Write a protein that binds this DNA or RNA. Structure first.
Lengths: 50, 79, 52, 174, 141, 49
RNA sequence: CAUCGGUUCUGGCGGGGGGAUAAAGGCCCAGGGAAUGUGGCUCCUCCGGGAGUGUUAUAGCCCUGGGUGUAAUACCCUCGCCGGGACCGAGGACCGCGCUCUGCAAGGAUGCUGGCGUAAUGGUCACCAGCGACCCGUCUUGAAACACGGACCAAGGAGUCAA
C-alpha cells in the first residue's frame, strides 16, 4: 500500500517536472531537449512465412 | 471507315497468364540489362546539377534577391 | 480456474492493489495544477516561431 | 496529403570537442504528424549539410498555427516537383484561409493535374499576397474581383441514398 | 611494407606459450613462410623455438573445424591486440574493485553499451537558428 | 528490468479494433504500420488490447 | 425474466493535464496604414448607374502592442461513471487471495416463473433450396500434360519359409 502510494506520487512528480523544465527553458529563451526514451514495446505484425 | 454499321473483331483486353508472366520476365531482364549498360556506359555525367532557378511570376522574387545579396554581403563581412 | 480482469472486476483490483480504493476516493486522476499566474511567451519565441 | 500541420523543426549536430556549440537549423515542414516531420527534417538536412540522424539531434518540434484562420487570404506557392524529365519549378496560387489548407489544396491539385506524389514534391516557399495586385493567376483574379456575385445553376438536390423511390421528379433550381 | 631493409624490432619481441599472435607474411624472407592460406589469421602460441614459433589455427573443412599447428618464423608473426582490451580491462577491474571494496560504495563494473542520452537544455543566445529551404537560395541564384 | 521482462511471458494481443492502415506492410512514415511510430504506439496498444 | 461471472461490440456523461499555459474570436485601450475607397464633394450620363478625389464621415477592413485572461473551444493524452446488445456457465463439501466485513460481484450460475410431458425436442432416410466441390489408380519429371488400366458384381489374388 505504501509502495503504491510512493509510485503514484513519483509518476505525478516526474510528469510535472518534465513540464516545468520545458516551461522554464521556454521562459528563459532556450530549448529543453527531453531525454530519449529508455523503454520500447515491440509488436510483431507480420507472419512466419518466407 | 464504316465501323459503326459493321464492326470488326473486338480487341480483347483480357490478358493471358502466359503473356503476363512473359511480359514480367522480359521487364525484369530489361531492367537488369539497362543496369548493366548503365554501369558500362561511357557517356559523361556532370557531378553538379543544373538548377532550374526562380520563377519569374513569383511576386517577391525581387525581395528574395535582396535577401540573398544581403546575406552574401553579411557572410563576406563575417569572413 | 478463471482469470478475471482487474480493470473490470474491482474485487481483483483491490486484491492485487490495495491502494486502488484510496486512489478512487482521493481522486488522484483529477489532480489540478499548481496555482499562480503563468508568465507570458517571450517575444523572441513567437518571432522565431513565425519567422519565414 | 492528409490533415497537415506545419511544424518548426529545429535540429543540430551532436556536440563534440571541436564544436561545443554547433549551429541550429530550423525548418518549416508540412507533415501529418511529428514523426513524419522529423523524418522530412532529416531528409532535407541530409540534402544540405553534413548532419544525419545518427550524428545529430532534434532540439525542438513545435506546431505553427495560423494567426488568422478566419480571414480569406491569397497564397503563392513556389515548388519544385520531380517528373520523368527532371525537376521543374511551379508557381501556383490558392485562395484559402490557412497555409496548411493551401498546402493540402496544392498536394491535391498536383496529384490531379501532374500525377505528382508526396515523395516527389519539394515545397520551397509559401507566401501571403498582401495586395491583390500581387495575384497573377487568372483563376484567382476572377475571384478577387469587385462585387463578385454569381448564381449556382443546375444544383442537383441532395436526396438520401437509402430512399430508393420518389413520387416527384426533382427540380434543379434551388 | 616498404622494399629493402626489414625493421629489427621484429627480433626483439619475446613470444611465450599462450600468447595470441597474428600472421602477417613478409615477402622478403622466404624461410619459415606458411602456406598461401593461414596468412592474416590469428592464433595461439604453443611452441617457442629459436627463430620460429608454433601457432594453433582452426581451419574449416566441409562442416567441421580442424586444429592445425603451423611453424612460422618470427618474421611473419606479429603480436595481436585482440586481448589487450581484455588484459587492460581485467587489471582495471582488479584495482577498481579493490578500491571500491575498501571504500564501501558499490559500483557498476561491467562495460555497458551506448545508452540513450539524458535531457539537457540548449541556449539560443549567440546561437540563433537559421532558416533553411529545401534548396539553397544562393544555389537558386 | 531484464529479470522482470524475462519473467513476463510475451504478450499475445488480439487484432486491432478498427483495423490497420489500408496498406499495412509499409513503414509508418510512408503511410503504413511498420517501424518506429514513437508515441503513436499507444493507440495501437489500445486497439490490440 | 431477475441478479451474477468470463469475453466482446457500441452509445452517452462528469473531471484532470499539455501546446504560443492552443491559435482564434467578442468587448475595451493606444498607435499606424491601405483599397476590391464608406459617407461627402466634383464630372458624365440611357440619369439606372459609372468615373475621379481621399483614410471614417451618414460603412468598414488590415497591421502592432496592452487588459478582461490562468477566457472558451478544437486537437492530443488521461482519471472515472452510467446505459444497450451478443456468445459462453468449464469445476463440483471446506481450504486460498481479499473486500465495502451480520455479509459479499472474493480459487468458473444461480434464483423465480410458464407451457408441454409427446414425436413437442432430438435422430435416420428421400427430395427441394443457398454455398462449396474436375475421375480414380499408375507413370513422368522438379512437376503438369500426354500415355496406360478401369462395363459391372461375387470369390481367389502378391515381402513368405529355411540357412
Amino acid at each position: 500500500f505504501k509502495r503504491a502510494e510512493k509510485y503514484v506520487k513519483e509518476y505525478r512528480e516526474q510528469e510535472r517536472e518534465k513540464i516545468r523544465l520545458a516551461r522554464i527553458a521556454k521562459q528563459q529563451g532556450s530549448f529543453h531537449i527531453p531525454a530519449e526514451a529508455k523503454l520500447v514495446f515491440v509488436i510483431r505484425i507480420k507472419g512466419i512465412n518466407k | 471507315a464504316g465501323t459503326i454499321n459493321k464492326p470488326k473483331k473486338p480487341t480483347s483486353k483480357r490478358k493471358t497468364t502466359r503473356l503476363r508472366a512473359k511480359i514480367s520476365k522480359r521487364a525484369a531482364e530489361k531492367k537488369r540489362k539497362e543496369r548493366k549498360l548503365a554501369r558500362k556506359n561511357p557517356e559523361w555525367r556532370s557531378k553538379l546539377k543544373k538548377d532550374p532557378g526562380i520563377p519569374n511570376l513569383f511576386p517577391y522574387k525581387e525581395r528574395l534577391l535582396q535577401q540573398i545579396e544581403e546575406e552574401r554581403i553579411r557572410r563576406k563581412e563575417e569572413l | 480456474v478463471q482469470k478475471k480482469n482487474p480493470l473490470r472486476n474491482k474485487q481483483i483490483m483491490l486484491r492485487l492493489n490495495p491502494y486502488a480504493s484510496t486512489f478512487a476516493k482521493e481522486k488522484l486522476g483529477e489532480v489540478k495544477a499548481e496555482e499562480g499566474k503563468p508568465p507570458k511567451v517571450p517575444a523572441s519565441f513567437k518571432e522565431l516561431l513565425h519567422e519565414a | 496529403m492528409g490533415r497537415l500541420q506545419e511544424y518548426q523543426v529545429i535540429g543540430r549536430h551532436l556536440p563534440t570537442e571541436a564544436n561545443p556549440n554547433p549551429a541550429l537549423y530550423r525548418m518549416r515542414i508540412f507533415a501529418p504528424n511529428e514523426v513524419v516531420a522529423k523524418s522530412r527534417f532529416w531528409y532535407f538536412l541530409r540534402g544540405l549539410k553534413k548532419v544525419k540522424k545518427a550524428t545529430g539531434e532534434i532540439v525542438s518540434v513545435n506546431v505553427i498555427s495560423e494567426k488568422h484562420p478566419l480571414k480569406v487570404k491569397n497564397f503563392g506557392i513556389w515548388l519544385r516537383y520531380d517528373s520523368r524529365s527532371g525537376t521543374h519549378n511551379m508557381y501556383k496560387e490558392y485562395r484559402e484561409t490557412s497555409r496548411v489548407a493551401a498546402v493540402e489544396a496544392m498536394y491535391a491539385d498536383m496529384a490531379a493535374r501532374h500525377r505528382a506524389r508526396f515523395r516527389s514534391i519539394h515545397i520551397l516557399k509559401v507566401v501571403e499576397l498582401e495586395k491583390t495586385e500581387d495575384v497573377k493567376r487568372p483563376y484567382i483574379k476572377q475571384l478577387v474581383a469587385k462585387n463578385l456575385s454569381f448564381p449556382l445553376p443546375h444544383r442537383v438536390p441532395k436526396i438520401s441514398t437509402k430512399k430508393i423511390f420518389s413520387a416527384k421528379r426533382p427540380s434543379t433550381f434551388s | 611494407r616498404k622494399h629493402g631493409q626489414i625493421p629489427l624490432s621484429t627480433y626483439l619481441r619475446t613470444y611465450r606459450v599462450g600468447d595470441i599472435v597474428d600472421i602477417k607474411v613478409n615477402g622478403a624472407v622466404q624461410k619459415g613462410m606458411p602456406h598461401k592460406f593461414y596468412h592474416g589469421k590469428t592464433g595461439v602460441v604453443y611452441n617457442v623455438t629459436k627463430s620460429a614459433v608454433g601457432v594453433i589455427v582452426y581451419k574449416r573443412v566441409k562442416h567441421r573445424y580442424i586444429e592445425k599447428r603451423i611453424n612460422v618464423r618470427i618474421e611473419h608473426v606479429k603480436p595481436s591486440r585482440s586481448r589487450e582490451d581484455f588484459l587492460r580491462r581485467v587489471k582495471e577491474n582488479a584495482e577498481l574493485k579493490k578500491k571500491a571494496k575498501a571504500e564501501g560504495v558499490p559500483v557498476q563494473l561491467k562495460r555497458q553499451p551506448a545508452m540513450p542520452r539524458e535531457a539537457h537544455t540548449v541556449s539560443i543566445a549567440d546561437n540563433k537558428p537559421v532558416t533553411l529551404a529545401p534548396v539553397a537560395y544562393e544555389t537558386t541564384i | 528490468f531484464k529479470q522482470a521482462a524475462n519473467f513476463l511471458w510475451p504478450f499475445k494481443l488480439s487484432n486491432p479494433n478498427g483495423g490497420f492502415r489500408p496498406r499495412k506492410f509499409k513503414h509508418f512514415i510512408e503511410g503504413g504500420d511498420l517501424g518506429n511510430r514513437e508515441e503513436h504506439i499507444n493507440a495501437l496498444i489500445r486497439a490490440m488490447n
